[PDB]
Amino acid sequence: YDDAKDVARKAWEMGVSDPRKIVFSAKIGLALTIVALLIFYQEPNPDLSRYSVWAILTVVVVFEFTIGATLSKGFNRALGTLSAGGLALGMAELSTLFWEEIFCTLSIFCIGFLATFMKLYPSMKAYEYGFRVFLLTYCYILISGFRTGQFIEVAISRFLLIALGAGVSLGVNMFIYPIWAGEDLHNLVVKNFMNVATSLEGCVNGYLRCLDPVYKGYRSAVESTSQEESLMSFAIWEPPHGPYKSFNYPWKNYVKLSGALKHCAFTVMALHGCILSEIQAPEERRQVFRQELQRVGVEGAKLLRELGEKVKKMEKLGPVDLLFEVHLAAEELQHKIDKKSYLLVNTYESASALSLATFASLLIEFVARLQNVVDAFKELSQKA
Amino acid sequence: YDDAKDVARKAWEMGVSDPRKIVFSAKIGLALTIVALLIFYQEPNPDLSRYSVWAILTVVVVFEFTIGATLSKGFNRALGTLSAGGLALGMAELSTLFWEEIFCTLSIFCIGFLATFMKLYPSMKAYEYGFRVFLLTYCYILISGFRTGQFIEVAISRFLLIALGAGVSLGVNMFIYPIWAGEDLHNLVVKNFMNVATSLEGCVNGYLRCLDPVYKGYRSAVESTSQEESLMSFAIWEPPHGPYKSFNYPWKNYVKLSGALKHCAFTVMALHGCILSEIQAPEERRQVFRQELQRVGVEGAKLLRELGEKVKKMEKLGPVDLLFEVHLAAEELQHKIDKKSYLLVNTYESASALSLATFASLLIEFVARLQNVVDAFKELSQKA
Q: How large is the C-alpha radius of gyration of chain A?
A: 29
DSSP B92-160: HHTS----HHHHHHHHHHHHHHHHHHHHT-STTSS-HHHHHHHHHHHHHHHHHHHHSS--HHHHHHHHH
Whole-Å CA distances, A35 to A28, A50, B280: 11, 14, 65
- In chain B, which residues have their Cβ closer than 8 Å to the Cβ of A117? 21-22, 24-26, 28
B47 vs B6: CA distance, rounded Å: 47
- In chain A, which residues have their Cβ closer than 8 Å to the Cβ of B270? 266, 269-270, 273
Please give the DSSP secondary-structure letter assigned to residue A342: G
The burial class, CB within 10 Å (0-12 / 13-18 / 19+), for A48 is: middle
Query: B343 — phi, psi (to 5°)?
Result: -95, 25
Residue of A118, A361, A373, A374 to mutate for B, most B C-beta atoms under 10 A = A361
Q: Are residues A191 and A326 in the same domain?
A: yes
Nearest chain B CA: its distance from A219 CA (Å): 11
B363 vs B353: CA distance, rounded Å: 17
Q: Are residues B214 and B80 in the same domain?
A: no
A196 vs A300: CA distance, rounded Å: 11
Are the C-beta atoms of B139 and A60 separated by less than 8 Å? Answer: yes
Among B135, B157, B175, the domain-final residue is: B175
The burial class, CB within 10 Å (0-12 / 13-18 / 19+), for B196 is: buried
B180 vs A200: CA distance, rounded Å: 43
Q: Are residues A29 and A164 in the same domain?
A: yes
Please give the torsion angle defined by the CA atoms of residues A62, A66, A72 and A75, in that order, rounded to the nearest 10 degrees.
20
Spatial CA neighbour of B363 closest among B293, B302, B295, B305 = B293
3-state secondary structure A191-234: HHHHHHHHHHHHHHHHHCCCCCCCHHHHHHHHHCHHHHHHHHHH
B7 vs B313: CA distance, rounded Å: 38
A7 vs B328: CA distance, rounded Å: 53
Are the C-beta atoms of A323 and A374 separated by less than 8 Å? Answer: yes
A33 vs B142: CA distance, rounded Å: 13
Q: Are residues A229 and A371 in the same domain?
A: yes
Q: Determine the residue type at A329.
A: A
Please give the torsion angle defined by the CA atoms of residues A287, A288, A294 and A295, in that order, rounded to the nearest 10 degrees.
160
- A155's CB contacts (< 8 A; 6+ apart) are A85, A89, A141, A144, A145
Q: Are residues A89 and A211 in the same domain?
A: no
Give residue A335's region: left, alpha or beta (phi > 0; psi -120 to 50).
Answer: alpha
A228 vs A186: CA distance, rounded Å: 10
The distance from CA A77 to its chain's CA centroid, rounded to whole angstroms, is 21
Are the C-beta atoms of A371 and B284 separated by less than 8 Å? Answer: no
Spatial CA neighbour of A185 closest among A16, A14, A66 = A66
- This entry's atomic model was obtained through cryo-EM
Q: Are residues B15 and B60 in the same domain?
A: yes
Are the C-beta atoms of A53 and B53 separated by less than 8 Å? Answer: no
A17 vs B222: CA distance, rounded Å: 30
- B26's CB contacts (< 8 A; 6+ apart) are A113, A117
Spatial CA neighbour of B202 closest among B218, B191, B190, B185 = B218
A55 vs A51: CA distance, rounded Å: 6
Please report, for the domain that includes residue A335, its CATH number: 1.20.58.220
How many other C-beta atoms can be found within 10 angstroms of the C-beta atom of residue B17?
8
A101 vs A232: CA distance, rounded Å: 46
Sign of the Cα torsion A229, A235, A236, A242 reads negative
Please indicate whether, in this complex, the C-beta atoms of A144 and B346 are within 8 angstroms of each other. Answer: no
Please indicate whether, in this complex, the C-beta atoms of B361 and A351 are within 8 angstroms of each other. Answer: yes
- In chain B, which residues have their Cβ closer than 8 Å to the Cβ of A364? 279, 351
Please indicate if any CB of chain B lies within 8 Å of the CB of A271: no
Please indicate if any CB of chain A lies within 8 Å of the CB of B278: yes
Query: DSSP 3-state assignment of A275?
Result: coil
Please give the DSSP secondary-structure letter assigned to residue B209: -
- A248's CB contacts (< 8 A; 6+ apart) are none
Give residue A314's region: left, alpha or beta (phi > 0; psi -120 to 50).
Answer: left
B155 vs B145: CA distance, rounded Å: 8
Q: Are residues B54 and B169 in the same domain?
A: yes
Query: B262 — phi, psi (to 5°)?
Result: -60, -35
Please indicate if any CB of chain B lies within 8 Å of the CB of A240: no
A368 vs A330: CA distance, rounded Å: 9
Spatial CA neighbour of B68 closest among B189, B242, B233, B228 = B233
DSSP A135-156: HHHHHHHHHHHHHSS--HHHHH
- In chain A, which residues have their Cβ closer than 8 Å to the Cβ of B11? 118, 121
Whole-Å CA distances, B195 to A101, B201, B228, B330: 51, 10, 16, 22
Say which of A117, A270, A368 has its CB closest to residue B24.
A117
B301 vs B295: CA distance, rounded Å: 10
In chain A, residues 161-220 whose CB comes closer than 8 Å to chain B? none
Among A106, A140, A175, the domain-final residue is: A175
Q: Are residues B21 and B156 in the same domain?
A: yes
Please indicate whether, in this complex, the C-beta atoms of A335 and B347 are within 8 angstroms of each other. Answer: yes
Please report, for the domain that includes residue B270, its CATH number: 1.20.58
Give the ranges where chain B is alpha helix by DSSP (H): 2-17, 21-39, 46-61, 67-93, 100-119, 128-147, 152-175, 182-207, 215-223, 225-235, 254-274, 283-286, 290-313, 324-340, 351-354, 357-382
Among B138, B157, B175, the domain-final residue is: B175
How many other C-beta atoms can be found within 10 angstroms of the C-beta atom of residue A350?
16
Whole-Å CA distances, B321 to A47, B297, B307: 76, 19, 11
B339 vs A289: CA distance, rounded Å: 26
Are the C-beta atoms of B271 and B203 separated by less than 8 Å? Answer: yes
How many other C-beta atoms can be found within 10 angstroms of the C-beta atom of residue A284?
7
Whole-Å CA distances, B26 to A118, A128, A253: 11, 18, 44
Q: Are residues B194 and B126 in the same domain?
A: no
Say which of B49, B334, B346 has its CB closest to residue A147.
B49
Query: B95 — phi, psi (to 5°)?
Result: -105, 40
- A9's CB contacts (< 8 A; 6+ apart) are none
Q: Are residues A167 and A227 in the same domain?
A: no
Are the C-beta atoms of A195 and A217 separated by less than 8 Å? Answer: yes
Please indicate whether, in this complex, the C-beta atoms of B28 and A56 are within 8 angstroms of each other. Answer: no
Please indicate if any CB of chain B lies within 8 Å of the CB of A343: no
- Strand runs (DSSP E) across B192-308, as ranges? none
Domain of A368? Answer: 182-313+321-382
B20 vs B179: CA distance, rounded Å: 8
Are the C-beta atoms of B360 and B293 separated by less than 8 Å? Answer: yes
- Secondary structure tally for chain B: helices H, strands E: 16, 0
- A163's CB contacts (< 8 A; 6+ apart) are none
Q: Are residues A106 and A208 in the same domain?
A: no
How many domains does chain B fold into? 2
Please indicate whether, in this complex, the C-beta atoms of A341 and B345 are within 8 angstroms of each other. Answer: yes
- Secondary structure tally for chain A: helices H, strands E: 16, 0
A41 vs A43: CA distance, rounded Å: 7
The distance from CA B232 to its chain's CA centroid, rounded to whole angstroms, is 8
The burial class, CB within 10 Å (0-12 / 13-18 / 19+), for B80 is: buried
Q: Are residues A219 and A353 in the same domain?
A: yes
Please give the DSSP secondary-structure letter assigned to residue B251: T
